[PDB]
Design a protein around this ligand. Sequence first.
Ligand code: HEM
Ligand code: HEM
Ligand SMILES: Cc1cc(N)nc(C#CCN2CCC(F)(F)CC2)c1
Ligand SMILES: Cc1cc(N)nc(C#CCN2CCC(F)(F)CC2)c1
Ligand SMILES: C[C@H](O)[C@H](O)[C@H]1CNc2nc(N)[nH]c(=O)c2N1
Ligand SMILES: C[C@H](O)[C@H](O)[C@H]1CNc2nc(N)[nH]c(=O)c2N1
Ligand SMILES: [Zn+2]
Lengths: 413, 421
Amino acid sequence: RFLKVKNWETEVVLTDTLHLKSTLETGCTEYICMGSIMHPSVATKDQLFPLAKEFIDQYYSSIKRFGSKAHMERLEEVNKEIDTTSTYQLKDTELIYGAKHAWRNASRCVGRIQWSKLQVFDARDCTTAHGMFNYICNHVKYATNKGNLRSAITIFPQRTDGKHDFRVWNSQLIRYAGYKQPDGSTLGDPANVQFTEICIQQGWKPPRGRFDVLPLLLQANGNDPELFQIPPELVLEVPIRHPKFEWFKDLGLKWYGLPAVSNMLLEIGGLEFSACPFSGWYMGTEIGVRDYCDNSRYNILEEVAKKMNLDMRKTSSLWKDQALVEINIAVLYSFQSDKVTIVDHHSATESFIKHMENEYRCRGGCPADWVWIVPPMSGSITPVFHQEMLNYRLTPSFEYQPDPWNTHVWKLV
Amino acid sequence: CPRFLKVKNWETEVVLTDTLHLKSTLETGCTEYICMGSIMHPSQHARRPEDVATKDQLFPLAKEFIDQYYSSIKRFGSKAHMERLEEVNKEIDTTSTYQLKDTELIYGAKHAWRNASRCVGRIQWSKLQVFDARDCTTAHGMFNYICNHVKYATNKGNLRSAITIFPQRTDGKHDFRVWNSQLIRYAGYKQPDGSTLGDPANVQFTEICIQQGWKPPRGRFDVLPLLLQANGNDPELFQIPPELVLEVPIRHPKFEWFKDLGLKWYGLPAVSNMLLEIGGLEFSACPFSGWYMGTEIGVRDYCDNSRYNILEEVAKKMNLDMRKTSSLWKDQALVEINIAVLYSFQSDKVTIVDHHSATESFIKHMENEYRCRGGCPADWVWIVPPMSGSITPVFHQEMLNYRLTPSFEYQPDPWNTHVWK
Ligand code: HEM
Ligand code: HEM
Ligand SMILES: Cc1cc(N)nc(C#CCN2CCC(F)(F)CC2)c1
Ligand SMILES: Cc1cc(N)nc(C#CCN2CCC(F)(F)CC2)c1
Ligand SMILES: C[C@H](O)[C@H](O)[C@H]1CNc2nc(N)[nH]c(=O)c2N1
Ligand SMILES: C[C@H](O)[C@H](O)[C@H]1CNc2nc(N)[nH]c(=O)c2N1
Ligand SMILES: [Zn+2]
């Protein structure tokens, strides 16, 4: 089997053979497409052998040592551990490779041209929440790099029996707090209200402001999670101003420089790393469109249009669209002026097309999620809009997992 | 088709439960392992084989549709339904095809629209004027029917949705075709240097027209002649009477210089290259029209790189930092252009809907359909507008895609498959 994808802007046609090696479901059936479903729907000894074999096979294939003496001994050694301990431990090389390929396989990530420049911090020796904090701070400092951002991941001990999971309860390492007011309004980031309430309950004393960096909520070895404040000198932040509108800085807007997803699960050879925060740098629209302009988020469109003296009486004036662009200009200009790494959605999508072409050539394809790859603004004027994409699930993979507070059974009475 | 599939709106948390998908009939192109939701044409799964079907091939599809239609009018198993089956059975027994009742044709056309998972406009789906052109025998007659469609649908700017349905496919050698992709489109000319004048999408069709003897005025907005094929014969050129072609000169409510770009668009989007499939019958010529979502013109027609590509020209006039992309100069000009398109259509009282109104309407339609029908097939990739997607409600709306019949289908451009006489 082969599959063609076509770019309708360039008429380039790529041939995906890589899809033959996927194994878990898309969620789609032969007769329904679930391409727009956000989330469609611990291993025994016997479940774990084939998964581990598959991963050791492809690692050794990647490094041109398939069938080698070292490949067969590694395969045998993995089976022993799974026989002995019902699990096994990745070598450091495998762990680095697994983590880079999970990023490589992230069909929803437009920034994968960078996938092989990933700093892997092996934190599998970690045993307590303080340890996770230290590991995470070092991650933050290294990744932030005074604004010259570097992609990195810190991998904490894999799942064992599901009762001793490591988790970062934060969804990102740096996020702003959300407080719902009695009058119904929200101060700060409405997306983080629930998690803010959990922190407050765990003892966090909130500054109750608009951009309070949340504390880390860290869970080691299935124990109750524990609060830590990131040292403020490690939280690099960019105050948002506009190159044309002097009044823009008076919105008091800022964002953090470091996007650092911490709520996902890293799966490598059947091993599950429930705590694996990873970071890169922002595409402008993540902040300028979603964080700032989703009605469920900071919802600054009416404020910005107001200060632009836009006619907001009818939608067809396109005051929202107009305000959105300026906000996104400001975000990009702000970051670039403070020499904090950021990519505009045009640059980001252009590189992804180049990445996707290269991936088809050397790897035989590139699973890609159009719903996610296409930026949330100016969709068709980016090249990815016109690029057909095949979506399929390769492993190593980043996986969603339940929020820890829906599953954690609390220890201390 | 599992057991009952929920879709959630992540802006409102509204969850809708889908059972309609059980009635899905042909493959989406996806599998458990690979999703083709961004493939323009993912499947080749037809209800019936390409050529003159046998009885056991056509009748089951006919039985399905007639069953569906009589069910729709609460007459399942009734006298008329059981006669209709026997009638279709004899008809197929004798002519290898069958003819639709007017009611059935109208039902079928509206449900093809209703089932068009890619159409954001389907809240209107039952307000569709159906012109029966199944008595048409020549390209001239096709021109007459089309002009009447255009005039009725245009309605002096108060646009009305319409479909005109020419005789169905019989053996495949006697197809009626509108060779135009839309009834009204602008020519595209390849320039001596290498660039393109007019609309690059239509260069090939423009060439067939010139090659067929059309005298190109060779402008940027030359309304293409109709190229109509009746009963498999060679297609014939007809000039649509310009008084029937409503056009809007694009100006801006603030940029008085915008009028001087010399841009205009036509008022009536009228898809004419698609196939309407009903109970196994195949209407290869079925021009349908409604009215524009502004972004179709302002974003795609005007701003695609392989279309009119007016961005840099408009950006220049705006005095925009065009050195680097991070200035978002494209994004900024894009918004101004779409303000202009909407402002111009509305100033001339020509029906148009912005992408905010349209998407909000479609959310409402989805809700209605889950209420009454138990589901609504929707192609998120096509529904979400090509600009400002996430500030429209449909970006945050999960959608299930599945293929219901009756339906509109793509079909090969006739010049790939037509043997001239
Ligand atoms: C280097 C710069 C990077 C850029 C510019 C980038 C860009 C993006 C963007 C725009 C998204 C969509 C986010 C959203 O709209 O919510 C995304 C998703 C994602 N990225 Fe990247 N990314 C980068 C680095 C990374 C790294 C280093 C990893 C992992 C090692 C990664 C893994 C993922 C995953 C798993 C998703 C899906 C997240 C989800 O499903 O919620 N990315 N990326
Ligand atoms: C009445 C106002 C209507 C509006 C505002 C509307 C809106 C749209 C838009 C924006 C698209 C996507 C076009 C593109 O990006 O290429 C579309 C596609 C489509 N519409 Fe509608 N539409 C309308 C009427 C109709 C009617 C009357 C029919 C059929 C009787 C119809 C059937 C379809 C179909 C089949 C598609 C898919 C076209 C394709 O796959 O190439 N629409 N519609
Ligand atoms: C490494 C990286 C770089 C970048 N620019 N974006 C992302 C992302 C994302 C998606 N994000 C949605 C919100 C969340 F659930 F909190 C975490 C997941 C990740
Ligand atoms: C009835 C109607 C209303 C509306 N507003 N848009 C459409 C459309 C379309 C899709 N279009 C793509 C380009 C084409 F192939 F040339 C013709 C078909 C249809
Ligand atoms: C309903 C839809 O699946 C949902 O809104 C998706 C759309 N595409 C997205 N794309 C990105 N990059 N991030 C998102 O959160 C979403 N949300
Ligand atoms: C590759 C991709 O499917 C293609 O560019 C699609 C994307 N979504 C679209 N959506 C609409 N409404 N119209 C289109 O032509 C397209 N093109
Ligand atoms: Zn799919």
